[PDB]
DNA sequence: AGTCGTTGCTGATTGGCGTTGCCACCTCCAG
DNA sequence: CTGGAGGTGGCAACGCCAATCAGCAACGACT
């Protein structure tokens, strides 16, 4: 029995001006091909299927096309709602998805399901647990919910020799975050302790975009996004985990490298250094244009240095997406810094500054 | 953006169908071209067609629609304007037309027929007013409110940017720099303060304090506060451009909440002055330099490759006009095509490329050269 | 074989900040019951399924619930794009609906297909044609006029219909199958599409009109209309869904099925007294849900804060008022009979009388208004 | 109201003290006199000095007071403007001056000192700012908002009356014709209606009905309604004036609640259209005719005999400028004396007497002819 | 000391922002 | 061909508020 574990697809994410449609398509077809090759029994997607609560048209077409192509393969599939995914966007099509060997869970409290093998015999217990909204149920509340949900699954399994799998979309101690990772439970919880997970035979988690073994035990994993969703993780290869079970216990876990189709590179240093670093692509003729983040270390005006940057790039098969200085322009500074610069001109009493900062941050988060 | 061809039919004094195609033999050099002719001949009407076909508006008339249309010539049943422009190496066509009922001049005005289509592909991109306006704003980067301030300088409105309200100036700056999150923050802060105040009818005082700092409906306060950096970045380019146009003055940002630009008089021992005190010609040159800088502020995203201005040169003497024309000729080296409306004999003699809008006496109509007829 | 003809659902439409979710759900359930009762083979939805390109979540939920509950009956379903809904929005679910006994068409060029009966035998040739957007069927070219472009569009759409019907006939061949046709465009039996340009199909199920009617006296070309009242101008009219039957490869008959009204609405005219008299008819009725009213107060220069009056009149009633308006439009300006009169010569009372003479009031209030006006001149002196 | 003498000291680019007398050997014929010179020389400064002396205010600067004085020349501690004008055959004198603390080129702006006096006997009639403004308004009949519409036409604001909003046109007309009672009637009606309403009756209903007819705050509604006769008289006078200034167009009021004027193009079979469609030169001529009609309207109550046109002559072509100048000469042959500022080379020859203003080799200052030096 | 010159303290406008309403434009339709 | 209903947005008149100018009375500098 085999299961492919992936998460944080972030479908429909607009990377600056660019879009990730081609990357997502070339990932989904490869995933279907590898699923057929390894004759996997199920595919699990634990959170952040869509970049936002109102996905664009093409993202939904990609999702539906992938689900349709799944039928030709024969594997069962599970969808979970992440922190960015929204109920009434994944949960609205749930009833149609049932007819296509796919179960979609977005709201908590769903009873554990028996995941069938390719032959129709029971294979495991799923314990579908999506990103738990605090309003739907704190550290103990997550723990006892997990224990109670696992206990209910344990009662369902009885004495049958089947593995028990659990799901979750949450941050854990010892994890490494990124810029694209949106934080959760800003005012109530800081991190979940890895030792409070119920003794399930395997745990599938998302939220973190970097593959990590958490807590030191093998049966808990972060699978991470399948494509680079930020410029700080371009060089790291992305993984999808093919877990295996036998005689009701974990057998082995394997990492599969997702073939990169969209090159992305980050430049550094002064303009003189960048004029040499750009020669990596001189007359190379990369048929997919490379996406570049340029961390120029100068004090010159951004709206003036971008002109010469574009002039240098025009002779190369490259496309620059972002330029950042390592006087200031409004496109550079953070909203928090800009608001603080307003607070500085006002009286600098911390007793009110802390409350005003919290209020401004919660307002900005309500915009986002 | 640059204009490839202009086709108009029965607008103002230009009865008939006229097609002006640039990139021909006379306009191949991208050099200076001037539209000349008597007053009331329809010179501005040529520039009105370009704005009409693109943004369904003209500088003189707020809107043209079924309910009113004062642009189509009298004793005529239809009018249309169509322009070909090129953005990032790909050509597009905009089309706006209107016909009177039963083809009779007394008939009621029908709804306009608008389109937007690629020139080489031929595929239609938009067919409705709102769809066409939004798509062309996204494609060009600039809608009408930015076209009329950074690409076409209408008659008597060159000083619109300087004389505009700080609210309008900040809104234009956000439109060009795409920084509306600050306005959204301010607006929602004001809305939440109002909601808390009504729920009262210790959170209320803190909400009111934050509202007094950055809160305002439609985000006036925080927009104005945030756009100061953009104003400074614009002032830098404005000084760079103005150094060639008029060497006496330099620009410097006002140190006040209402974002404004002061001026530094280098001849008067660098004494700084308010911008209201400038002369007419000095204010025209300052506004021209500031508009050129405003079109250079977004050069990396969506470059603008043409500039049209309307009889702003009448306020300049024979020497300042010569300096301004030398600066414009030097800027023409960059490849920005400049079109000027004027009556000054000196500059009319200087510029060799002309579009003569000849006038027909008595009838009140006018015609171009025979080569532009169709 | 039997099919239904419906269109203009306009799912997700907001009607004066109100939502039609319950009404649409009730209509869909009734349609499912009717299909089960009448043993229908297919259902055709001629465009305007969604009221916008990006329908809200509950509209998509209703569409999904309908298309999943239709699986019990086993009857086919055809959904076409209108001028309202989005081609990409409908093409989102094309392949997923292809597994659910449902076919959706949004783009042009989709080849004719054979509708199977409930037992799987070939029943009819569908020949699906959605709302033909101009960007799909024509290529713009420079040097044309506003009417010439429309003429080219009409010629192109007529040619498209003719060619697609020829292909459908080629597909049919010899088997006695009625070639149904579909479209979502305006016909008048100019910018409209003439009815005589339609191909000689056995049936043409059109859309874009919310009122059920026959075009050109040809019973095989019909507008099914909306199944629910989408505006106050059609509140009192009954809504129909056509039930079409075919026999031996030719059209047999058309039957109109009344859609029961779920949310009652009414419109009122006249002065405030007439409004009160018409509201008297709802004094004691258990109304579930409350009836929605449009009130058009005939103007006699009452000029009062009528919103408060309506709120007070309808407060105790089981009535919710969505809109009230009045026809108060009139110009107010002086006509100078001759240039010899200047504002210094005319007295204040004379100017006020000139003002009042432009209003068509009577002596029942003219005397009192003149007295009130003279009181102002009295108190300034 | 005729300007006899003008004295100014250290305003804008005109350093030092100067006086211009319009009764000397030049200006004896009361003909056209053209203030000429390069841009930024102090031409507009002369008219600004006149306006400042009369009404403590400038077309460019909203107010000059104890603060924000920016009309005074740099590195200078005192400025003053004095004029002599004649009304009803007797002459007066107006004076406005401001000096810096301790007579330093920096320091606090002291409160300005103003006065108004007769030249017949030297008696001081008013010295307070408010009293001087009230007394000069009563004496002349022209406030600032009427002086700047009838006698002085600033550059770019010639069409201000044409493009003004209805409220500020009706308010101008009622004050010009001395028919202000209708505004007070609306104010009283609105106040009575509001007072009746706040107590909460059929009397309130009658008050509401009366308010809907004529009542409005600040007296806008009934004033706009009543001033139709005044606008018709004004447009009659303007049409009579315009027949000789520009023969193509006529003027008439439109059937609308807003006080607006439409043109009747006599060339195109009397096709009537709105003034928004007028060309720049045609609108300049229409506005000049309307200003002359404004002057002629009150000629039976208080006569104004001076007119100053700052700019807008450039908008006209040569073949029209000569006709406009011929009409101006015909008007000047009467008691009215008119002065025109322009840079166009055609007007250099036609006007023989010029108040030349010259800059000095980039020092930042300027001086006019030494014969005007004090 | 006198005299003038400069500085600090109340009341009447006036511009700015928000509120509510009315009117106009665009779009999809129906007489 | 025209009207017309239903969003959607822009402008305008009114209400309340904070800033500013003008008037007044009380100290510093120069003769
Ligand atoms: N609807 C119309 N029908 C006919 N002529 C018109 C119409 N509207 C404006 N005109 C005239 O068309 C001419 C346009 O001239 P314009 O381009 O404004 O001149 P300029 O370039 O000198 O400013 C003017 O004579 C104007 O009055
Ligand atoms: N406070 C000031 N001190 C000195 N010069 C000034 C001051 N304010 C304005 N100026 C200058 O005085 C000149 C006035 O020129 P102006 O009369 O406006 O010219 P024009 O008649 O060509 O319009 C300009 O150069 C202006 O910048
Ligand atoms: Mg000037
Ligand atoms: Mg013009
Ligand atoms: Mn996440
Ligand atoms: Mn994630």
d(C-alpha B308, C-alpha C229), whole Å: 53
Closest residue in A to B296 (Cα) is: A303
Nearest C-alpha neighbor of B339 from the set B308, B295, B312, B305? B308
d(C-alpha D281, C-alpha C298), whole Å: 49
Q: What is the CA radius of gyration of chain C?
A: 29
Taking the alpha carbons at both ends of chain C, their separation in whole angstroms is: 90
Nearest C-alpha neighbor of A66 from the set A106, A9, A118, A107? A9
Specify which residues A253 forms β-bridges with. A243
Helix B181-200 with A335-345: angle, nearest 10 deg? 60
Show the tokens assigned to A128. Answer: 């579908």
Task: Spell out the long-range contacts of B18-22 with Cβ–Cβ below 8 A and sequence spacing 24 or more.
Answer: B18/B368, B18/B372, B18/B373, B18/B374, B19/B372, B19/B373, B19/B374, B20/B46, B20/B355, B20/B368, B20/B372, B22/B337
Return the ligand 1 atom nearest residue D263 CA.
Answer: 27
Nearest C-alpha neighbor of C90 from the set C126, C127, C133? C133
**Angle subtended at Cα D255 by Cα D252 and Cα D256, rounded to the nearest 5 degrees:** 115
Closest residue in C to D235 (Cα) is: C339
Q: Who contacts C30 (Cβ-Cβ below 8 Å, separation ≥6)?
A: C259, C260
Show the tokens assigned to A142. Answer: 């997550």
d(C-alpha D195, C-alpha C293), whole Å: 35
Nearest C-alpha neighbor of C78 from the set C55, C46, C108? C46
d(C-alpha D145, C-alpha D168), whole Å: 10
Q: What is the CA radius of gyration of chain A?
A: 23
Label the pairing between strands C265-270 and C102-105: unpaired
* Whether residue D328 is found in the same domain as residue D209: no
Centroid of ligand 5 to alpha carbon of A51 (angstroms): 9
Q: Cα separations (Å) of B8 from A297, B97, B369?
A: 51, 9, 14
Q: What are the strands, taking DSSP E only, across B124-207?
A: 124-126, 152-153
Closest residue in C to B116 (Cα) is: C140
Domain span at D358: 2-141+302-372
- Domains, chain C, ordered by start: 2-259 (3.60.21.10), 265-326 (3.30.160.720)
**Angle subtended at Cα B70 by Cα B68 and Cα B72, rounded to the nearest 5 degrees:** 115
Nearest C-alpha neighbor of B37 from the set B338, B346, B341? B341
* Ordered DSSP codes for B226-291: HTHHHHHHHHHHHHHHHHHH-TTEEEEE-SSSS--EEEEETTTTTEEE-GGGS-HHHHHHHHHHHH
Residues in C 97-116 with any Cβ partner in A closer than 8 A: 98-100
Residue B31 in domain? yes
Show the tokens assigned to D350. Answer: 């036609």
Torsion of CA B15, B19, B20, B23, to 10 degrees: 180
Q: After which residues does chain B break, using C–N > 2.5 Å?
A: 201
Q: What are the strands, taking DSSP E only, across chain C?
A: 2-6, 14-15, 18-19, 42-46, 76-80, 102-105, 114-116, 122-125, 180-182, 203-206, 213-215, 218-223, 240-247, 250-258, 265-270, 291-297, 319-326
Chains with 3 or more CB pairs closer than 8 angstroms to C? A, B, D
Method: cryo-EM
d(C-alpha D51, C-alpha D274), whole Å: 33
Produce one character per residue of C323-337: b if its CB has 16 or more CB atoms within 10 Å, e if not. Answer: ebeeeeeeeebbeee
Please identify, among D223, D256, D291, the residue that sits at the C-terminal boundary of a domain: D223
* Whether residue D194 is found in the same domain as residue D137: no
Q: Distance (Å) from CA B11 to C1' F10? A: 27
Which residue reads 């009885």 in tokens? Answer: A158
Show the tokens assigned to B274. Answer: 């308010």
Give the 3-state secondary structure of residue C346. Answer: coil
d(C-alpha D238, C-alpha C344), whole Å: 20
Which residue reads 């005729």 in tokens? Answer: D2
Residue B242 in domain? no
How buried is C348 (Cβ within 10 angstroms: 0-12 exposed, 13-18 middle, 19+ buried)?
middle
Cβ-contact B151, B304 below 8 angstroms: yes
Return the ligand 2 atom nearest residue B265 CA.
Answer: 27
How buried is C297 (Cβ within 10 angstroms: 0-12 exposed, 13-18 middle, 19+ buried)?
buried
Sign of CA dihedral B174, B179, B182, B185: positive
Q: Tell me if D36 CB under 6 Å of ligand 2.
A: no
DSSP state of C259: P
* Whether residue B133 is found in the same domain as residue B14: yes
DSSP state of B373: B
* Whether residue D24 is found in the same domain as residue D130: yes
Label the pairing between strands C76-80 and C102-105: parallel
Cβ-contact B11, B71 below 8 angstroms: yes
Label the pairing between strands C213-215 and C218-223: antiparallel
Q: Write down how long chain A is.
A: 368
Residue A60 to chain C, least CA–CA distance (Å): 6
Task: Give φ, ψ of C22 to 5 degrees.
Answer: -65, -45
Nearest C-alpha neighbor of A204 from the set A52, A2, A4, A51? A4
Centroid of ligand 3 to alpha carbon of B339 (angstroms): 25
* Whether residue D27 is found in the same domain as residue D129: yes
Give the 3-state secondary structure of residue B370. Answer: helix
Helix D228-245 with D318-332: angle, nearest 10 deg? 110
d(C-alpha B75, C-alpha B370), whole Å: 23
**Angle subtended at Cα B280 by Cα B274 and Cα B283, rounded to the nearest 5 degrees:** 50
Query: Could you give the count of Cα atoms lying within 13 Å of B319 in the half-sphere of its Cβ?
Result: 7
**Secondary structure element (H or E) that encloses residue B36, with its range:** strand B33-36
Cβ-contact C166, C186 below 8 angstroms: no
* Whether residue D129 is found in the same domain as residue D197: no
Please identify, among D223, D249, D281, the residue that sits at the C-terminal boundary of a domain: D223
Q: How many CB atoms lie within 10 A of CB A218?
A: 12
CB pairs under 8 A between B and D: 113
* Whether residue D216 is found in the same domain as residue D123: no
* Whether residue B61 is found in the same domain as residue B192: no
CA C140 centroid distance within chain:
30
Maximum Cα interatomic distance, chain B, rounded to a whole number of Å: 78
d(C-alpha A96, C-alpha C281), whole Å: 46
d(C-alpha A101, C-alpha A113), whole Å: 13
Q: Tell me if B314 CB under 6 Å of ligand 2.
A: no
Show the tokens assigned to D301. Answer: 């109550």
Q: What is the CA radius of gyration of chain D?
A: 23
Q: Tell me if B277 CB under 6 Å of ligand 2.
A: yes
Q: What are the strands, taking DSSP E only, across C47-201?
A: 76-80, 102-105, 114-116, 122-125, 180-182
Taking the alpha carbons at both ends of chain A, their separation in whole angstroms is: 41
Nearest C-alpha neighbor of D172 from the set D139, D150, D140, D157? D150
Residue B365 in domain? yes
Binding-site residue numbers of D are 37-44
Query: Could you give the count of Cα atoms lying within 13 Å of D222 in the half-sphere of its Cβ?
Result: 32
Nearest C-alpha neighbor of A1 from the set A353, A338, A242? A242
Asked, as a colleague might, if the bond just before A9 is cis with ω within 30 of 0, I would say no
Number of folded domains that form chain B: 2
* Whether residue D55 is found in the same domain as residue D115: yes
Within 8 A of A352 by CB-CB distance, chain B residues are: 206, 209
Cβ-contact D266, D249 below 8 angstroms: yes
Cβ-contact A59, A67 below 8 angstroms: no
Q: What are the strands, taking DSSP E only, across chain A?
A: 2-6, 14-15, 18-19, 42-46, 76-80, 102-105, 114-116, 122-125, 165-168, 202-205, 212-213, 220-222, 239-246, 249-257, 264-269, 290-296, 318-325
Within 8 A of C88 by CB-CB distance, chain A residues are: 57-58, 61
Q: What is the CA radius of gyration of chain B?
A: 23
Q: How many CB atoms lie within 10 A of CB C89?
A: 20
Show the tokens assigned to C140. Answer: 């713009």
Q: Any contact of B with A, at least 3 CB pairs below 8 A?
A: yes
Q: Do C64 and A96 touch (CB under 8 A)?
A: yes
Cβ-contact B3, B83 below 8 angstroms: yes
**Angle subtended at Cα B303 by Cα B301 and Cα B304, rounded to the nearest 5 degrees:** 145
Q: Cα separations (Å) of B20 from B46, B77, B82?
A: 9, 22, 10
How buried is B40 (Cβ within 10 angstroms: 0-12 exposed, 13-18 middle, 19+ buried)?
buried
Give the 3-state secondary structure of residue A77. Answer: strand
Cβ-contact D26, D353 below 8 angstroms: yes
Cβ-contact C40, C76 below 8 angstroms: no
**Secondary structure element (H or E) that encloses residue B2, with its range:** strand B2-11
Q: How many CB atoms lie within 10 A of CB D76?
A: 15
* Whether residue B11 is found in the same domain as residue B128: yes
Q: How many CB atoms lie within 10 A of CB A277?
A: 16
- Judged by a CB distance cut-off of 8 A, whether residue A92 touches chain C is yes
Q: How many CB atoms lie within 10 A of CB C288?
A: 7
Comparing CB atoms, the residue among C301, C334, C343 nearest residue D179 is C343
Show the tokens assigned to A356. Answer: 């005003």
* Whether residue D8 is found in the same domain as residue D99: yes
How buried is D18 (Cβ within 10 angstroms: 0-12 exposed, 13-18 middle, 19+ buried)?
buried
Helix B318-332 with B228-245: angle, nearest 10 deg? 110
Convert A210-223 into a string of H (helix), E (strand) and C (coil). Answer: CCEECCCCCCEEEC
Maximum Cα interatomic distance, chain C, rounded to a whole number of Å: 100
Please identify, among D223, D257, D282, the residue that sits at the C-terminal boundary of a domain: D223
Cβ-contact D37, D43 below 8 angstroms: yes
Within 8 A of A331 by CB-CB distance, chain B residues are: 177, 179
Q: Residue D321 is part of a domain; what is its CATH number? A: 3.40.50.300
d(C-alpha B157, C-alpha B151), whole Å: 13
* Whether residue D204 is found in the same domain as residue D313: no
């Amino acid at each position: 029995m085999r299961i492919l574990h992936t998460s944080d697809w972030h479908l429909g994410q607009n990377f600056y001006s660019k879009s990730r449609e081609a990357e997502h398509q070339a990932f989904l077809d490869w995933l279907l091909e590898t699923a057929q090759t390894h004759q996997v029994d199920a595919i699990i997607v634990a959170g952040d299927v869509f970049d936002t609560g109102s996905p664009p048209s093409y993202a939904r077409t990609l999702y539906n096309r992938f689900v349709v192509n799944l039928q030709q393969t024969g594997c069962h599939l599970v969808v979970l709602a992440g922190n960015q995914d929204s109920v009434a966007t994944l949960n609205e099509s749930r009833d149609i998805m049932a007819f296509l060997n796919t179960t979609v869970v977005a709201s908590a409290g769903h009873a554990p399901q028996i995941l069938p093998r390719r032959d129709g015999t029971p294979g495991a217990v799923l314990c579908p647990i999506p990103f738990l909204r605090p309003r739907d149920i704190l550290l103990a509340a997550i723990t006892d919910y997990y224990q109670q949900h696992y206990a209910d699954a344990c009662k369902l399994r009885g004495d049958q020799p089947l593995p028990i799998i659990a799901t979750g979309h949450l941050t854990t101690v010892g994890a490494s975050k990124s810029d694209a990772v949106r934080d959760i439970y800003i005012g109530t919880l800081d991190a979940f302790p890895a030792q409070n997970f119920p003794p399930a035979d395997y745990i599938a988690l998302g939220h973190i975009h970097r593959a990590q073994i958490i807590g030191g035990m093998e049966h808990v994993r972060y699978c991470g996004s399948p494509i680079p969703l930020s410029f700080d993780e371009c060089g790291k290869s992305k993984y999808v985990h093919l877990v295996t079970f036998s005689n009701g216990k974990l057998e082995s876990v394997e990492n599969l490298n997702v073939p990169v189709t969209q090159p992305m590179a980050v430049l550094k240093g002064d303009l003189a250094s960048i004029t040499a670093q750009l020669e990596q692509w001189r007359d190379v003729s990369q048929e997919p244009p490379v996406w570049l983040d340029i961390e120029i270390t100068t004090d010159e005006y951004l709206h003036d240095i971008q002109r010469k940057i574009q002039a240098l790039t025009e002779s190369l098969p490259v496309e620059v997406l972002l330029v950042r200085r390592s006087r200031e322009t409004l496109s550079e500074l953070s909203v928090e810094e800009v608001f603080n610069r307003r607070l500085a001109l006002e009286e600098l009493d911390e007793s009110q500054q802390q409350r005003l900062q919290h209020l401004f941050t919660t307002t900005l988060h309500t915009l986002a | 953006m640059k204009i490839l061809s202009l086709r108009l039919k029965n607008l103002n004094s230009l009865k008939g169908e006229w097609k002006i195609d640039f990139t021909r033999e006379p306009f191949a050099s991208n050099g200076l071209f001037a539209i000349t002719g008597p007053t009331g001949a329809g010179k501005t009407t040529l520039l009105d067609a370009i704005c009409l076909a693109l943004y369904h508006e003209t500088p003189r008339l707020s809107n043209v629609s079924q309910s009113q249309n004062d642009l189509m010539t009298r004793d005529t049943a239809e009018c249309l304007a169509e322009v070909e422009f090129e953005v990032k190496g790909e050509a597009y066509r905009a089309f706006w037309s209107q016909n009177r009922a039963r083809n009779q001049p007394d008939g009621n005005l029908q709804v306009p027929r608008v389109e937007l289509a690629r020139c080489a592909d031929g595929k239609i991109l938009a067919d409705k007013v709102k769809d066409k306006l939004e798509l062309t704003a996204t494609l060009t980067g600039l809608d009408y409110g930015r076209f009329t301030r950074s690409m076409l300088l209408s008659q008597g409105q060159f000083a619109a940017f300087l004389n505009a309200k700080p609210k309008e100036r900040a809104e234009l700056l956000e439109e060009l720099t795409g920084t509306e999150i600050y306005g959204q923050i301010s607006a929602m802060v004001f809305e939440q303060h109002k909601s808390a105040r009504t729920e009262l009818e210790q959170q209320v005082e803190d909400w009111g304090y934050l509202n007094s700092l950055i809160g305002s409906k439609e985000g006036d306060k925080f927009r104005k506060f945030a756009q100061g950096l953009t104003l400074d970045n614009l002032v830098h380019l404005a000084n760079q451009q103005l150094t060639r146009l008029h060497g006496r003055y330099l620009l410097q940002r006002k140190a006040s909440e209402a974002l404004e630009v002061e001026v530094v008089d280098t001849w008067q021992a660098d004494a700084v002055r308010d911008t209201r005190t400038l002369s007419g010609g000095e204010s025209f040159l300052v506004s021209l330099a500031l508009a050129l800088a405003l079109s250079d502020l977004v050069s990396h995203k969506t470059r603008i490759d043409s500039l049209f201005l309307d009889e702003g040169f009448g306020t300049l003497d024979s020497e300042t006009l010569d300096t301004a024309l030398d600066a414009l000729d030097a800027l023409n080296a960059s490849g920005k095509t400049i079109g000027v409306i004027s009556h000054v004999e000196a500059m009319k003699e200087r510029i060799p490329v002309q579009i003569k809008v000849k006038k027909i006496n008595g009838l009140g109509y006018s015609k171009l050269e025979s080569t532009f007829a169709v």
